[PDB]
Write a protein that binds this ligand. Structure first.
Ligand SMILES: CC(C)=CCSP(=O)(O)OP(=O)(O)O
Ligand SMILES: N[C@@H](Cc1ccc(O)cc1)C(=O)O
Length: 398
């Protein structure tokens, strides 16, 4: 029997909505953790956390393909996104998931942008995990979301849990609400400037790229992510989207307009993986745009880490598989072909079993949507890769 079956046998029974979320999310998270070879106690801990702090605040059951909100977590507005980080050296993958919790007050004057449940989750986790630090959490929360702060993307905050084989890490995401005088980039920049960083050199590099560079001026910052650790050890990830999709544009953004050098081998491998996962022709000119997709989340997406740990900011690119690839199976086989060609595909069949579990009954080879992004980071001569997965509760109602 699995961990979820044991816990579901013995834990107290839940009301209809909560029990639906338990019997849906429990098996998914447990299957992902099992295919990634997590220790049994970590699976038990993960599902126990899920049972106590996530499931009670997930809101009503899906009952149709119509989502109860326009949540920014996923395109069909599923409030959960899983992610599977590939580790080099035949190491085990890392599993994470992001959740936006909800309450009956969402949209009301008491909580018009659905922030209270995420805050409650962060504080409960702080009660259990003493290593969490809420200094930067509170700072960026007040500055971007609280009283006196300012069009919406559909959410303003969500949280993520990283099961890092032995301990739990928490990430927080702020989605600023834009006004004619306060853009998301404006709010994020002024909050980072008020955050008390030692150095702001990477922030100023990103600011100069976005303001002055011809490619950087095509990027629209929209989201900030932090780690709930000591602020000196946290990352500062600024996410930005562009209508541009050419790989020349992606490479220039990866280099921050040529600021980062000694990345040519990494970017060659990235070009290969990009064509493979999107299903492109191997001879596709890096100057060509991908065929137009007009969506709130189409275009190329990146995040810039401006953590004061370094003076040059680091860039991560997200290949938008759901918008540009032909189908999830083709995209997964492309990613796996790259991984096995570079000796990092020890968990390929496990990843595929996870996809088959998450995928709508008989849609892996006919549609996209399960895999939202393939995230790429340039680590010396190698790539760090992460798959992001959408359970598609509403786009695939069962
Ligand atoms: C909101 C979600 C699920 C992903 C945003 S990108 P990430 O923070 O998961 O990437 P890393 O944790 O830095 O590896
Ligand atoms: N769902 C939003 C926010 C998001 C961005 C990147 C992610 O990895 C996850 C979520 C988007 O696709 O733009």
């Amino acid at each position: 029997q699995s961990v979820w079956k044991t816990l579901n046998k013995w834990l107290p029974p839940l009301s209809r909505d909560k029990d639906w979320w338990w019997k849906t999310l429990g098996p998914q998270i447990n299957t992902l953790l099992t295919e990634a070879d997590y220790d049994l106690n970590e699976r038990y801990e993960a599902l126990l956390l899920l049972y106590r702090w996530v499931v009670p605040e997930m809101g009503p059951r899906p009952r149709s393909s119509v989502a109860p909100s326009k949540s920014f977590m996923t395109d069909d507005h599923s409030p959960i996104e899983y992610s599977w980080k590939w580790i080099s050296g035949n190491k085990k993958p890392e599993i994470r998931y992001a959740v936006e919790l909800v309450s009956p007050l969402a949209g009301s004057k008491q909580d018009p942008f659905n922030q209270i449940p995420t805050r409650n989750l962060v504080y409960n986790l702080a009660k259990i995990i003493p290593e969490l630090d809420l200094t930067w959490f509170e700072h960026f929360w007040h500055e971007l979301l609280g009283p006196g702060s300012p069009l919406t993307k559909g959410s303003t905050v969500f949280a993520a849990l990283e099961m890092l084989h032995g301990h739990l890490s928490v990430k927080v995401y702020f989605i600023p609400v834009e006004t004619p005088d306060f853009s998301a980039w404006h709010q994020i920049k002024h909050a980072i400037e008020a955050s008390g960083c030692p150095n702001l050199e990477a922030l100023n590099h990103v600011d100069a790229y976005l303001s002055s560079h011809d490619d950087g001026r095509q990027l629209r910052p929209f989201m900030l992510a932090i780690d709930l650790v000591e602020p000196a050890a946290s990352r500062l990830k600024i996410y930005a989207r562009s209508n541009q999709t050419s790989f020349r544009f992606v490479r220039d953004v990866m280099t921050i307009g040529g600021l980062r050098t000694d990345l040519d081998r990494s970017i060659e491998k990235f070009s290969d993986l990009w064509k493979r996962a999107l299903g492109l022709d191997p001879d596709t000119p890096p100057e060509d745009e991908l065929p137009k997709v007009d969506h709130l989340t189409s275009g190329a997406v990146f995040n810039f880490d401006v953590a004061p740990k370094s003076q040059i900011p680091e860039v991560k690119a997200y290949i938008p598989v759901r918008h540009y690839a032909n189908n999830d199976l083709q995209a997964a086989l492309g990613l796996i072909g790259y991984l096995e060609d570079h000796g990092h595909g020890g968990y390929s069949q496990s990843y595929l079993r996870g996809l088959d579990m998450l995928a709508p009954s008989g849609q892996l080879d006919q549609a996209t949507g399960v895999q939202t992004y393939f995230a790429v980071a340039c680590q010396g001569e190698d790539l760090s890769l992460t798959s992001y997965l959408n359970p598609q509760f509403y786009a695939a109602f069962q």
